[PDB]
Amino acid sequence: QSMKIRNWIKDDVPQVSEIAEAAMPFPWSEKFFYDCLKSNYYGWVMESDHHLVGFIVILMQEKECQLMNIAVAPRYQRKGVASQLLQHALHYAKTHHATRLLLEVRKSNRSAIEFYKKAGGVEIGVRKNYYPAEKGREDALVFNLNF
Ligand SMILES: CC(C)(COP(=O)(O)OP(=O)(O)OC[C@H]1O[C@@H](n2cnc3c(N)ncnc32)[C@H](O)[C@@H]1OP(=O)(O)O)[C@@H](O)C(=O)NCCC(=O)NCCS
């Protein structure tokens, strides 16, 4: 019943990448998660049942914030894990003078879309043919969350 939330560290990347492989359509490589270890990128992980079950990564840029990725292992979904991770991330962003969280997500990524909408996210635009798809390209929906 213990649950731990903390900033992520380089040792977390293999499990984070495993969560991505399990949960995210078109998942980031292990090397993509090293890529946002660098400055202005901030991450958190949740530990439940003695292992990592979800992570969230934001980018602080200009005066506002971008949600780069959020994912929860499928066996731990629909229990509030992402909700808690997002709350922790938004507390950090709000303390660092941000008020709007940007998310870009594949049009077909239903779960991330419905999650963000129930957190207060609002669609503000579409980037057509923004992601590579198995054939052709896939639109990105663009959401804003005020906080
Ligand atoms: C989106 C995601 C992180 C949600 O994680 P989670 O821990 O299950 O989310 P929560 O339990 O905190 O969600 C909260 C509310 O979101 C809504 N919702 C969440 N997932 C949903 C889904 N798959 N389908 C429909 N509604 C959903 C629910 O209304 C949920 O509230 P409830 O549990 O009271 O029913 C998870 O589906 C995931 O990892 N998806 C793939 C990740 C991804 O694609 N990342 C890249 C784009 S950011």
Short mmCIF file of C-alpha atoms and ligand atoms in Angstrom, two decimals:
data_model
loop_
_atom_site.label_atom_id
_atom_site.label_comp_id
_atom_site.label_asym_id
_atom_site.label_seq_id
_atom_site.Cartn_x
_atom_site.Cartn_y
_atom_site.Cartn_z
CA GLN A 1 0.00 0.00 0.00
CA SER A 2 3.06 2.20 0.10
CA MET A 3 3.30 4.70 -2.76
CA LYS A 4 6.28 6.89 -3.53
CA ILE A 5 6.44 9.87 -5.88
CA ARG A 6 9.80 11.44 -6.65
CA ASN A 7 11.82 13.13 -9.31
CA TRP A 8 13.25 10.67 -11.80
CA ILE A 9 16.95 9.90 -12.08
CA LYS A 10 19.07 8.29 -14.77
CA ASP A 11 18.83 4.87 -13.07
CA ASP A 12 15.04 4.95 -13.72
CA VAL A 13 15.30 5.08 -17.51
CA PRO A 14 15.13 1.32 -18.21
CA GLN A 15 11.91 0.91 -16.26
CA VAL A 16 10.48 4.15 -17.67
CA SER A 17 11.21 2.87 -21.15
CA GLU A 18 9.54 -0.44 -20.25
CA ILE A 19 6.42 1.47 -19.11
CA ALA A 20 6.48 3.30 -22.44
CA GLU A 21 6.78 0.05 -24.40
CA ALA A 22 3.84 -1.39 -22.44
CA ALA A 23 1.57 1.70 -22.48
CA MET A 24 2.34 4.26 -25.16
CA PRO A 25 1.41 3.95 -28.86
CA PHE A 26 4.55 4.37 -30.96
CA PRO A 27 6.74 4.40 -27.86
CA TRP A 28 9.84 6.44 -27.20
CA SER A 29 13.09 4.50 -27.33
CA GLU A 30 15.28 4.08 -24.25
CA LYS A 31 17.58 6.64 -25.90
CA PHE A 32 14.71 9.19 -26.25
CA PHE A 33 14.32 9.18 -22.42
CA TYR A 34 18.03 9.94 -21.97
CA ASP A 35 17.51 12.80 -24.44
CA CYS A 36 15.24 14.69 -21.98
CA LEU A 37 17.53 14.26 -19.03
CA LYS A 38 19.03 17.58 -20.10
CA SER A 39 18.36 21.11 -18.84
CA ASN A 40 14.80 22.49 -18.53
CA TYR A 41 13.30 18.94 -18.70
CA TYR A 42 11.76 17.65 -15.47
CA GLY A 43 10.44 14.20 -14.70
CA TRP A 44 8.78 12.29 -11.87
CA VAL A 45 8.08 8.60 -11.31
CA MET A 46 5.56 6.77 -9.10
CA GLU A 47 6.60 3.63 -7.27
CA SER A 48 3.83 1.21 -6.22
CA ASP A 49 4.23 -2.48 -5.29
CA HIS A 50 8.03 -1.97 -5.12
CA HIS A 51 8.53 -0.98 -8.78
CA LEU A 52 7.92 1.98 -11.09
CA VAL A 53 4.36 2.15 -12.47
CA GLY A 54 4.16 5.53 -14.18
CA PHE A 55 6.13 8.61 -15.13
CA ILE A 56 5.56 12.13 -16.38
CA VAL A 57 7.96 14.47 -18.21
CA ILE A 58 7.50 18.21 -18.72
CA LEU A 59 9.44 20.92 -20.52
CA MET A 60 9.67 24.40 -18.97
CA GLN A 61 10.01 26.79 -21.92
CA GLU A 62 9.55 30.56 -22.21
CA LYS A 63 6.94 31.43 -19.54
CA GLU A 64 4.77 28.28 -19.96
CA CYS A 65 5.00 24.50 -19.71
CA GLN A 66 4.71 21.52 -22.10
CA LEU A 67 3.67 17.95 -21.21
CA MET A 68 6.16 15.85 -23.16
CA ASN A 69 4.95 12.45 -22.05
CA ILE A 70 2.89 10.73 -19.38
CA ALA A 71 2.38 6.99 -19.16
CA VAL A 72 1.14 4.34 -16.66
CA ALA A 73 1.77 0.64 -16.93
CA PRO A 74 -1.46 -1.02 -18.12
CA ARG A 75 -1.94 -3.15 -15.01
CA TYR A 76 -1.88 0.07 -12.93
CA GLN A 77 -4.19 2.18 -15.12
CA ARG A 78 -7.55 3.63 -14.08
CA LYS A 79 -6.48 3.98 -10.44
CA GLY A 80 -5.49 7.67 -10.40
CA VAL A 81 -1.75 7.15 -11.01
CA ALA A 82 -1.54 9.63 -13.92
CA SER A 83 -3.79 12.04 -12.02
CA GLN A 84 -1.36 12.10 -9.10
CA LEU A 85 1.68 12.43 -11.39
CA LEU A 86 0.09 15.33 -13.23
CA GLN A 87 -0.86 17.07 -9.96
CA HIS A 88 2.78 16.82 -8.83
CA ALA A 89 4.05 18.13 -12.16
CA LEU A 90 1.61 21.04 -12.12
CA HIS A 91 2.59 22.02 -8.60
CA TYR A 92 6.19 22.31 -9.85
CA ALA A 93 5.16 24.29 -12.95
CA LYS A 94 2.93 26.66 -10.95
CA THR A 95 5.80 27.39 -8.54
CA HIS A 96 7.96 28.27 -11.55
CA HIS A 97 5.56 30.91 -12.85
CA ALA A 98 3.63 28.78 -15.39
CA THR A 99 -0.17 28.76 -15.87
CA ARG A 100 -0.81 26.82 -19.10
CA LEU A 101 0.20 23.24 -19.93
CA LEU A 102 0.50 22.30 -23.66
CA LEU A 103 0.00 18.73 -24.88
CA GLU A 104 0.41 17.39 -28.41
CA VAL A 105 -0.88 13.88 -28.90
CA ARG A 106 -1.69 11.60 -31.84
CA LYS A 107 -5.29 11.89 -33.01
CA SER A 108 -5.77 8.14 -32.44
CA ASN A 109 -4.41 8.21 -28.86
CA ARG A 110 -7.82 7.95 -27.26
CA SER A 111 -6.71 7.18 -23.72
CA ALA A 112 -4.33 10.15 -23.43
CA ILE A 113 -6.99 12.40 -24.99
CA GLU A 114 -9.75 11.33 -22.59
CA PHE A 115 -7.37 11.56 -19.62
CA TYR A 116 -6.34 15.09 -20.48
CA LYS A 117 -9.89 16.23 -21.09
CA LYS A 118 -11.04 14.97 -17.68
CA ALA A 119 -8.14 16.95 -16.12
CA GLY A 120 -9.38 20.19 -17.67
CA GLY A 121 -7.60 20.09 -21.05
CA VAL A 122 -9.20 21.82 -24.04
CA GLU A 123 -8.41 21.25 -27.69
CA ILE A 124 -6.96 24.37 -29.28
CA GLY A 125 -5.70 23.12 -32.64
CA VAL A 126 -4.63 20.36 -35.01
CA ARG A 127 -1.22 19.88 -36.66
CA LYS A 128 -1.99 17.86 -39.78
CA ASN A 129 0.27 14.95 -40.69
CA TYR A 130 2.65 15.70 -37.86
CA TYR A 131 3.64 12.15 -36.78
CA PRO A 132 4.87 9.20 -38.86
CA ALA A 133 2.30 6.44 -39.19
CA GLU A 134 2.47 2.88 -40.49
CA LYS A 135 1.39 4.42 -43.81
CA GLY A 136 1.56 8.17 -44.38
CA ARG A 137 1.44 10.54 -41.41
CA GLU A 138 -0.95 11.17 -38.49
CA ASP A 139 -2.45 14.42 -37.22
CA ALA A 140 -1.55 15.80 -33.81
CA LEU A 141 -4.25 17.24 -31.59
CA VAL A 142 -3.07 20.21 -29.52
CA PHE A 143 -4.56 20.78 -26.06
CA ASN A 144 -4.15 23.50 -23.39
CA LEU A 145 -4.68 22.91 -19.68
CA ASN A 146 -4.98 25.95 -17.41
CA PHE A 147 -3.88 25.54 -13.78
C1 LIG B 1 -3.42 8.37 -20.36
C2 LIG B 1 -2.93 7.49 -19.19
C3 LIG B 1 -1.55 8.04 -18.69
C4 LIG B 1 -3.94 7.60 -18.05
O1 LIG B 1 -3.28 7.01 -16.95
P1 LIG B 1 -4.14 6.45 -15.70
O2 LIG B 1 -3.28 6.28 -14.48
O3 LIG B 1 -5.00 5.30 -16.15
O4 LIG B 1 -5.11 7.74 -15.47
P2 LIG B 1 -6.08 8.08 -14.23
O5 LIG B 1 -6.58 6.80 -13.58
O6 LIG B 1 -5.36 9.09 -13.35
O7 LIG B 1 -7.24 8.87 -15.09
C5 LIG B 1 -8.07 9.62 -14.65
C6 LIG B 1 -9.36 9.78 -15.33
O8 LIG B 1 -9.02 9.84 -16.86
C7 LIG B 1 -10.07 9.24 -17.66
N1 LIG B 1 -9.67 8.19 -18.62
C8 LIG B 1 -8.42 7.81 -18.24
N2 LIG B 1 -8.00 6.81 -19.05
C9 LIG B 1 -9.03 6.61 -19.91
C10 LIG B 1 -9.21 5.73 -20.95
N3 LIG B 1 -8.23 4.78 -21.41
N4 LIG B 1 -10.35 5.73 -21.64
C11 LIG B 1 -11.36 6.58 -21.32
N5 LIG B 1 -11.21 7.45 -20.30
C12 LIG B 1 -10.03 7.44 -19.62
C13 LIG B 1 -10.95 8.64 -16.62
O9 LIG B 1 -12.24 9.42 -16.65
C14 LIG B 1 -10.04 8.59 -15.42
O10 LIG B 1 -10.94 8.81 -14.32
P3 LIG B 1 -11.48 7.51 -13.54
O11 LIG B 1 -10.38 6.61 -13.21
O12 LIG B 1 -12.10 8.23 -12.24
O13 LIG B 1 -12.40 6.67 -14.44
C15 LIG B 1 -2.80 6.02 -19.62
O14 LIG B 1 -3.94 5.68 -20.42
C16 LIG B 1 -1.57 5.83 -20.50
O15 LIG B 1 -0.47 5.57 -20.06
N6 LIG B 1 -1.86 5.92 -21.87
C17 LIG B 1 -0.79 5.74 -22.88
C18 LIG B 1 0.19 6.86 -22.61
C19 LIG B 1 0.52 7.73 -23.79
O16 LIG B 1 0.06 7.46 -24.85
N7 LIG B 1 1.46 8.80 -23.64
C20 LIG B 1 1.87 9.65 -24.79
C21 LIG B 1 0.92 10.83 -24.96
S1 LIG B 1 0.98 11.86 -23.46
#
